[PDB]
Amino acid sequence: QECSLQSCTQHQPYVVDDPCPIHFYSKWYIRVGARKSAPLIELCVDEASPIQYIDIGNYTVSCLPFTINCQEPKLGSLVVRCSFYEDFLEYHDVRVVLDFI
Amino acid sequence: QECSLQSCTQHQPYVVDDPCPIHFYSKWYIRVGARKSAPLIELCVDESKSPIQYIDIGNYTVSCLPFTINCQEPKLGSLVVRCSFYEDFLEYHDVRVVLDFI
Ligand code: NA
C-alpha cells in the first residue's frame, strides 16, 4: 500500500517519476473509480496486453517515457504495477498522486 | 511521510487514520485544487463574515471527534493533515491523505 506524491504544472506535459525499484518492470494503469475491486485499465498498450485502450482525451502525452498532461485522472486512480519478473506474477502497486505548482 | 493511502467504502462514514507521528498535534485541511500556492481551508473550524466562505453541502465532514469523513475525494481539493510537535504549529509537516475505495 504505497503512495507516490509528485508535483507538476497543471495542464502541461509531465514525465511521471517511476516509483518502481530500479530494474523492475513497470506497467501503468488506471484503476477505475479508484475502487480496488474495479477494473485495472492498462495504459500505453502498443498493439494486440490483449486489449488496447485508447483515450478520448489528452491524458497521455507520450508512452516513452510515460508522460501525462499534468492532471488528476477522473476515470479512476493512476497506478503503477512494479514487478521484478516479466510475467508479473509477484508484484506491488503504487498509486501516483499529483500536487500542482 | 508525504502521502497516506487509505481504504474505505465510498459514500459511507470513515474515521480517518491520523498519519501524524505519535505525540504530534494534527489539524485537517483542504488544499484548494491541490495547488501548493492555493488556500488551505481548515476543517473542523466552524466559527463568520468574509467575502469568500466555504460550505459543506454534502456533509463531507461527518464528525470532528474523531475526524470522520464521508468516504470520498473532496472535489474542492486535496485532504491534508498538518502535523506539529508544538501546539503553536510553527514547525510542521503536511501529509496528504488519499483514498482507495473498497
Ligand atoms: Na478519487
Numbering used by the authors:
A (entry chain B): 18 to 65, 69 to 121
B (entry chain A): 18 to 64, 67 to 121
The authors write:
The accessory protein ORF8 is one of the most rapidly evolving betacoronavirus proteins (1–7). It has been shown that ORF8 of SARS-CoV-2, but not ORF8 or ORF8a/ORF8b of SARS-CoV, down-regulates MHC-I in cells.
The structure of SARS-CoV-2 ORF8 was determined by X-ray crystallography at a resolution of 2.04 Å. ORF8 crystallized as a covalent dimer with three sets of intramolecular disulfide bonds per monomer and a single intermolecular disulfide bond formed by Cys20 of each monomer. The core of each ORF8 monomer consists of two antiparallel β-sheets. Punctuated between what would be β3 and β5 of ORF7a is an ORF8-specific region of ∼35 aa from residues 46 to 83 that are structurally distinct from ORF7a and other Ig-like folds. These residues are responsible for a third, ORF8-specific, disulfide. Val117 forms a hydrophobic interaction with its symmetry-related counterpart.
